[PDB]
């Protein structure tokens, strides 16, 4: 999109020295003991994002045994017959935390509050009806 | 004759006694050279130049009395004055098998602190050159309640790591 690739890095964590001094004062963290420190804030260097996106190479085309699949789909469906679903109008959705990111390119002009707050119920129902075709 | 002790009981499976030279004591020499309390040089049979005899270290009972040395067992009053230094201790061992039989090898080490180390079976095998601290093959005790040790025959550790771990554990437990 733009003329230079961005390299994102991941900073290390922060240390709470008072609690560590407390815990060693009360006799924790002994050598050879069972409880210890195993959970840290690991840092990453430059080409971290792409080196993790590259992990999709384990996804390969897969052809399924169509008949046994057509049976197990019925059984799985039967595991799922105690609930109720169906479309609902715009004025019945429940959004917790209307203050998260809105994806790309929208995140250039505010959080999800903006778009969930600048489109009347008519526009939302019209958008649904549109994607239904 | 004679009262003896399990101390240094040569538990090797081999059947022949020792040649006078390269025998540690008198009892260990074979019977050929033995002619009334003395050994006689028979150049007929020569000396083996390779042999591995696993030695036992079972009952070591020290009550020595010297001046510049502090005795290693204390009474019931002095041990009371010196609490804050008490630490439990218990060991679970194994048995020697294919090259020698008769003794125990330590395998697990507990402490009053929750730590449990575990070592590899080693013993003090002697050799025509000298004594040698080397690996030995073993097997758990046949007691059924000891079956929870069968996995532990495939964990470490070389003793040169284990004793360092012990030193550091005791250090950071009793330094204050
Ligand atoms: Mg025990």
Swiss-Prot record, chain B:
Q: Which residues take part in binding Mg(2+) 1?
A: 90
User: Any idea which positions bind Mg(2+) 2?
Assistant: 92
Catalyzed reactions per annotation: a 5'-end (5'-triphosphoguanosine)-ribonucleoside in mRNA + S-adenosyl-L-methionine = a 5'-end (N(7)-methyl 5'-triphosphoguanosine)-ribonucleoside in mRNA + S-adenosyl-L-homocysteine
Q: How is its activity regulated?
A: Inhibited by Remdesivir antiviral drug (GS-5734).
Kindly identify the residues recorded as the active site.
90, 92
Tell me the subunit arrangement.
Answer: Interacts (via N-terminus) with DDX1. Interacts with nsp10.
Role summary: Plays a role in viral RNA synthesis through two distinct activities. The N7-guanine methyltransferase activity plays a role in the formation of the cap structure GpppA-RNA. The proofreading exoribonuclease reduces the sensitivity of the virus to RNA mutagens during replication. This activity acts on both ssRNA and dsRNA in a 3'-5' direction.
- Protein name in UniProt: Guanine-N7 methyltransferase nsp14
Species source reads Severe acute respiratory syndrome coronavirus 2 (2019-nCoV)
């Amino acid at each position: 999109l733009t003329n230079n690739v961005a390299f994102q890095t991941v900073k290390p964590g922060n240390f709470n020295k008072d609690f560590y001094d407390f815990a060693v004062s009360k006799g924790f963290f002994k050598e050879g003991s069972s409880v210890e420190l195993k959970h840290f804030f690991f840092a990453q260097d430059g080409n971290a994002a792409i080196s993790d996106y590259d992990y999709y190479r384990y996804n390969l085309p897969t052809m399924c045994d169509i008949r046994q699949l057509l049976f197990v789909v019925e059984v799985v469906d039967k595991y799922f017959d105690c609930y109720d679903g169906g479309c609902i109008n715009a004025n019945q959705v429940i959004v917790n935390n209307l203050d998260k990111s809105a994806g790309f390119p929208f995140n250039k002009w505010g959080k999800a509050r903006l778009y969930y707050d600048s489109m009347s119920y008519e526009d939302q129902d019209a958008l649904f009806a549109y994607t239904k075709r | 004759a004679e009262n003896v002790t399990g101390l240094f009981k040569d538990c090797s499976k081999v059947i022949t006694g020792l040649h006078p030279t390269q025998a540690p004591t008198h009892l260990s020499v074979d019977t050929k050279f033995k002619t009334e309390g003395l050994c006689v040089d028979i150049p007929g049979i020569p000396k083996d130049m390779t042999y591995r005899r696993l030695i036992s270290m079972m009952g070591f009972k020290m009550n020595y009395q010297v001046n510049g040395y502090p005795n290693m067992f204390i009474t019931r009053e002095e041990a009371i004055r010196h609490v804050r230094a008490w630490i439990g201790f218990d060991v679970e061992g194994c048995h020697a098998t294919r090259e020698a039989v008769g003794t125990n090898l330590p395998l697990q080490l507990g402490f009053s602190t929750g730590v449990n180390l575990v070592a590899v079976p080693t013993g003090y095998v002697d050799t025509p050159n000298n004594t040698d601290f080397s690996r030995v093959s073993a097997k758990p005790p046949p007691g059924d309640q000891f079956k929870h040790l069968i996995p532990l025959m495939y964990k470490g550790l070389p003793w040169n790591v284990v004793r360092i771990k012990i030193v550091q554990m005791l250090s950071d437990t009793l330094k204050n």
